[PDB]
Amino acid sequence: LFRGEHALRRYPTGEERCIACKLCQSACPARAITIETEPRPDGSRRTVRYDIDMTKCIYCGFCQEACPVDAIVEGPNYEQTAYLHEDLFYDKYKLLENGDKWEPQIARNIEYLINQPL
Amino acid sequence: SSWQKLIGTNLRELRFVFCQNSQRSLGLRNYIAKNYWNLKNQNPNFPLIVRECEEADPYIIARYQYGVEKKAFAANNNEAEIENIIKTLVEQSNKVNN
């Protein structure tokens, strides 16, 4: 359950899970999540901007609690120490690459948490 | 007569701002009703604007060249007094413009 670093997950096919529903943006207590959405040319509903201010984030897990597709999560990585306030400004690129890096352990923990009521 | 015919060249605009249902504007309203088409026919190319509001005071604004405005009060004025005010306004152009 440890709430580490905000990260964006993707389906096993490689398609990103986020559907740009802004529920995490509405549910963020500190308003650290900014989402701007434009439909993709194929017709899907995806974010063109998904920014999380890690300086405005209280690491509370409400984004992953409110995500209906388990796209945004908080991975166990706590060694996210940065030397620049700009480096602390996460964007969709950083979140997606972080989710790609940390998907296996995130997948294992999320699988265990899903199996608890299941 | 002559001053009515001279409105086209003596002035640049004539605006009548008054009220529909007030005793202050009764004379101005009656004069506009009676004498609008006489002036309009004598001066087919002259701007003769008529505006009315719920409680506006009766004013006859004479606009001369270079946008020189000569609004004049016309409250509780008989049709003769309205005609005299308009005649005075169409006779100040030589003094006002120079």
């Binding site: 900014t34 901007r49 920014d51 201010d53 | 701002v17 509001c53 409680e55 506006a56 004013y59 609004k71």
Partner: protein, 182 residues
């Protein structure tokens, strides 16, 4: 409590409902004295929830504006603004909201500045004031608040839907005899 009881003075003080006449004190206003006089003549004499003509009233900066807190050494711009007072009904998209709207007068200040700071493309408002509108249960209360804080007010009155004869029998009305209509 949108509608104060007009049958009794306890609705609100008569002084609050009064709209003071403009006094020309600027050079341009002295030049445009007839315009000021005519605006005073034509403007509504009282502001009540039963009115039908919207109107803009200037910010009366006098002892009435005494009870403001926004005239800060660092902020000399708030206490001159003109708010907009109007009842904001629920948007046309939905008709049965969880939290119904239209039971209060919204008082809204115009946006002074909005720009996207470029490092993260983040919306920044140059004026932290006017970010969120105020809500008042009564138009008299909103006007009193404007007078106390030295704000001018553009009041626009709500436009409600007309009552209509509704019945299911209207779906099966008899057209009429063919010969008679011809």
């Amino acid at each position: 409590m949108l509608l104060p009881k007009n049958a009794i003075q306890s609705a609100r003080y008569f002084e609050i409902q009064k709209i003071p006449a403009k006094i020309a004190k600027t050079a341009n206003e002295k030049i445009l004295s007839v315009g000021v006089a005519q605006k005073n003549n034509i403007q509504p004499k009282t502001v009540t929830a039963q009115g039908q003509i919207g109107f803009v009233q200037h910010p009366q900066l006098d002892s009435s504006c005494q009870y403001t807190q926004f005239y800060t050494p660092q902020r000399r711009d708030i206490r001159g603004r003109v708010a907009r007072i109007y009842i904001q009904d629920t948007n046309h998209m939905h008709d049965t909201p969880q939290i119904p709207e239209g039971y209060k007068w919204t008082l809204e200040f115009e946006r002074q500045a909005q720009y996207k700071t470029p490092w993260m493309g983040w919306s920044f408002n140059g004026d932290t004031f006017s970010k969120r509108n105020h809500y008042f249960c009564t138009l008299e209360d909103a006007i009193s608040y404007c007078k106390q804080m030295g704000f001018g007010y553009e009041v626009s009155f709500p436009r409600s839907r007309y009552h209509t004869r509704k019945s299911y029998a209207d779906n099966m009305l008899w057209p009429g005899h063919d010969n008679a209509v011809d």
